[PDB]
Design a protein around this nucleic acid. Structure first.
Ligand SMILES: [Mg+2]
Ligand SMILES: [Mg+2]
Ligand SMILES: [Mg+2]
Ligand SMILES: [Mg+2]
Lengths: 338, 338, 338, 338
DNA sequence: GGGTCTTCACACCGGTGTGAAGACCC
DNA sequence: GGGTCTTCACACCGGTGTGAAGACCC
DNA sequence: GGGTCTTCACACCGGTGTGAAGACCC
DNA sequence: GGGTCTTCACACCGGTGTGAAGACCC
DNA sequence: GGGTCTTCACACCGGTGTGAAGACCC
């Protein structure tokens, strides 16, 4: 349920409850009395609804109210069973709500993917929400595969092994001096679908919830493309940060300045689009600070300089995320052999 | 006082109290009931004592107990006047304690500077704490000037204007495309003293406290060297971070990869030492992650590759900070015309 | 509860509260305003959990944090009802915390006993915590009975009355000159189970808490073996001292040098293992000082000399106490008729 | 001064003040804000007066008021300079007051020694306090040397090296098995004066204070008899404990049961008198518990059994300590060749 | 490179909670 | 007049000052 | 029998369902 | 109309949930 | 002895104090 029905939380199980009492089980470093089950809170509120693509009153809501609703949905569960004992620290209400923004917004553009994949293969343009049809020539080798990425991923394992050896040579070349290229992985990698999946139906079946069946699918769809995509076909890379501070905006820059060195450079990609989706850009001069030239090209003169960040987006609603991702596919997929 | 005398807090003024009640004055975005006066808490505990160089029982204390003592010194003030009302948020107890680590540790190596400046000019080797004499030839053109840096500083204003024009050409060259080189400033910049100050006594008078007289001196000594030092004479750059997480260790990397591009490169410095001083490296694989090659040299083949971080230091005491900074000056100042 | 739930202390009774206000009832010698209920604090924190054998995050915690947690659990109760009045003297926070160490650590090896008794009688090797199975031949006349001992106990009343008369003859022989053999009793006496209890189920039912039902069982299980065990079958004697000073380590020596005279000697035991379990051995040269030969054998030449203390143990966790007591039973119970 | 003159504490030096502020000098384990100078507090109150032998109104005072007066003399100093900051922990008010009882009571029987030494050599019987003359034949080889002993002393170094080799053989014999004979030293060892000092005037000059001149004399007079006294001439051994608890009375038993084994036994002393001087025997059954037979003789049958403690004394005044020590010398020195 | 100084073990009692034997009428 | 209740010894560690051996350059 | 006390009108916004005009592609 | 004062970006760590590699006997 | 389970690094934002540039009349 989306609006905290009082009996479905009493019809649920203790395993699938929103908050597990770990007051009789510390974990040796943090004295966490109560924890917020991230995988259960997503299955509770967004379990039978998806923002952007369902129940258009939700799709016009403020996107700072869709994200951050499972956190207040968990507090109203916590003040029901654990009366007067309930405390969740504010540093725990930001980790989960940041990860809610990481998963849910990736699940909205998954629904934009499967509707884009429908129009490419000759199927119609689902019009249950009023979304405008893209004006591109429908070709089956244009469907896109959006992929959520894990915490310790390194993203080189998606490239074809004829191209993966150059990066491994560049990495093991740095290992001779005792060095390396450590990076943080971006929260979202948008790549085009390879040849082996041009008739598979798992890239067109639109998702209708965020239950744990269709939740390990989205965290685990990356493994089916592990070593398939050419380096010139990684279209978009989306870093997800819920709010920005005047120093936390630099950790996506080091995500891009490695991504614009191992692709532009050793594997010869032209330019990979890297962009940041935020909700609270206030308190920072972040739009000016994201006008940063990439440090990769600053050594070989002024041959080709460009931005390290494509755009800094502030989605006002959930449906405005889906409208932007359609116009992104309407322009980037023009430049392939349709 | 260091150990919370009960009457000096009652002999103090309401202006110089450790905590001002701003409960009748909000600031329109944060509902801060009580604030921690950072400039007053440093003047209260460390007002007549300096770690490392005074009262050797303090100098052998755990350095996580020296830093973080003004925060608990303020709580014991807050539970005295404002009984039962007192709440300071944990996100406010980290900003001040991080800034306490930024100022106090810079004030310890200031005392290492003025004793190094004494042995260079022919004065003796003050031995009130048992610190070993450096085995270098005493030359007056070897004394070092340690400088705390502000929040919006850009550090190019320290270079001589014959060398400052190249960086301004490289910056305004990027401004033609609507770009830039934004950076965070390091918390400490260690440079050698220029020719105009080789007889001045403000670089040898050892500081004996952290009162507001000798506090705007340390935050403001950088302006006296604004446009004096050659680019090949910036010896050490110290970034101060009290604890590290698996993503907050990247914001000093972007501080270094710009510092190793505007000095190595456009102004031809050989290699500028950049190092991070932390207290809690646990919960991270940060020593392996700080074995990162600089992204500046990764474009022109493999001409000269090196680390972007020199060392990751964990000071066990306060006197072990002073012992390391003496051996750093014992090695780096060998390579000048003594 | 283990981590101070705010309403179970409000759901508790005034009788079973953690701190009774005796401010309207002095006791004629000590002006104790507030007292720490030792029997209630054990029932509050460890009431539904046992260290070593439950909730393995607890079992890996530092053992100086398990013991000493009911003392800080009582302070957080005391600053709730009795606001600003609350003072417990530090000499009262050591007596209870020392007695907490006396009872809880005896209750951990009781759980090691009942699992050892299960494998001896043919029942399985409970594996809810991952504890290694002992490699001994399972015989029913090998199960062990661990016994907590009171404050004024004299431990001779456990021996069979055919052997108790020799000690009473030696005691009443000394009473003719107006003398005696006064001793302090050890906090723990580990003896093997007699013939009358080889089918009883009270030595195999594992304890699941420290509530006052299963608390007078552990302080009172000694009376069921009052006059049953032969003198050659007292395997281990454990003295419990939370921290050691350079003179408080001698009061277990006089506990051993009487125990190694009334058993080795008048009742002909070979050697009784006597060992001290401590948490803070710092500030002492106690490991060298516990290499003391027993004063019993120093009169008849050098016939048989040995240590008065077997080992000085420092348990790092709670599960490491259970691992040591299993390997102790794996070696000492080899030397009986299995 | 004895009764806290307000200007002699202001005429004193900061070095010889009763309390040094170590608030700017921790000592890495204890957070001692203010310390009680033990060597200065004895020089302040008892600096020009000695109990028992001076100003007979003092000598009739309660002996729990003479001892424990420098502790309250220090508190009245501490609430004068350090207003409202002053806190000395009760665990620090017992260590010093116990050591005050250790030094002052040893200094009273030093005055009984030098008056006993005067009557032995033919000098008169000083009668400034009305003390009864002993009825013994005055012989010069009967004068006694009372010795305060340090903290890490082992008391074997007082015996003649022809007798010291047997104990060293017995100790190194135990070292072959990795053992030893660790002991606590008694606070006072009373031995008879050897042949080399039968005309020296340092054993007859009566002490007239406890200033630091005549304070290192009393802690350091033991070194002049280091290896001089035969084992059959150690008359009295006094252990000093201010109050007794039901387990702290055993640490003098282990002091005696080694002293009644290395002297009775290996060096053939008949019986060495060992006694405990206490002020608060309440709360214990200590008089019955000090009726303990020595564990040395309990192995060779019932050849010769005796007490390990001679007497447990409770001195009501200071002059009653001097009256007991005169009657002790009136009986023990009858049994030498007068 | 024997002096200065930072460390460490030494032995220091005191306010304690609880069980068992005392107190006292009925 | 065996019950209730007021007492008492039991064994409980923890913050300590000072001497002697450590630390370290010169 | 003017004080005490039980009553009453005053004016206080806030969460609402439905029709009609908006929104948007086709 | 240069002073006073109200604002804002700066850089500040800390308590976190989950996946994957560790731990350990059998 | 491959399973179960105890651990750990990963990447997660949010409430902050202070300096410098803004605001505004005079
Ligand atoms: Mg992120
Ligand atoms: Mg920093
Ligand atoms: Mg004990
Ligand atoms: Mg003593």
């Amino acid at each position: 349920p989306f609006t905290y029905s009082i009996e479905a939380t009493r019809n649920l199980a203790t395993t699938e409850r929103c908050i597990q009492d770990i007051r009789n089980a510390p974990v040796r470093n943090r004295s966490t009395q109560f924890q917020l089950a991230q995988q259960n809170m997503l299955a509770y509120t967004f379990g039978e609804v998806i923002p952007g693509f369902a129940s258009a009153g939700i799709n016009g809501m403020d996107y700072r109210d869709v994200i951050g609703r499972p956190v207040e949905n968990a507090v109203t569960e916590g003040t029901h069973f654990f009366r007067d004992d309930f405390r969740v620290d504010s540093n725990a209400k930001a980790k989960v709500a940041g990860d809610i923004f990481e998963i849910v917004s990736s699940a909205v553009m998954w629904n934009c993917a499967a509707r884009w994949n429908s129009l490419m293969v000759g199927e119609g343009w689902r019009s249950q929400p009023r979304y405008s049809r893209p004006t591109l020539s429908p070709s089956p080798r244009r469907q896109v595969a959006v992929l959520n990425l894990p915490r310790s991923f390194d993203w080189v394992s998606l490239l074809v092994p004829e191209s993966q050896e150059v990066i491994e040579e560049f990495r093991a070349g740095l290992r001779k001096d005792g060095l390396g290229l450590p990076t943080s992985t971006p929260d979202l990698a948008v790549v085009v679908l390879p040849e082996e999946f041009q008739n598979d139906e798992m890239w067109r079946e639109e998702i209708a919830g965020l239950t744990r069946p269709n939740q390990i699918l989205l965290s685990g769809a990356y493994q089916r493309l592990q070593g398939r995509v050419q380096p010139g076909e990684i279209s978009l890379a989306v870093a997800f940060k819920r709010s920005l501070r005047s120093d936390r905006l630099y950790q996506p820059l080091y995500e891009a300045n490695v991504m614009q060195l191992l692709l532009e450079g050793k594997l010869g990609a032209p330019k990979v689009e890297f962009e940041v989706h935020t909700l609270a850009p206030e308190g920072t001069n972040a739009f000016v600070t994201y006008e940063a030239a990439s440090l990769y090209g600053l050594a070989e003169g002024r041959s080709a300089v460009h931005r390290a960040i494509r755009e800094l987006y502030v989605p006002p609603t959930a449906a405005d995320l889906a409208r932007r991702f359609f116009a992104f596919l309407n322009e980037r997929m023009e430049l392939v052999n349709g």
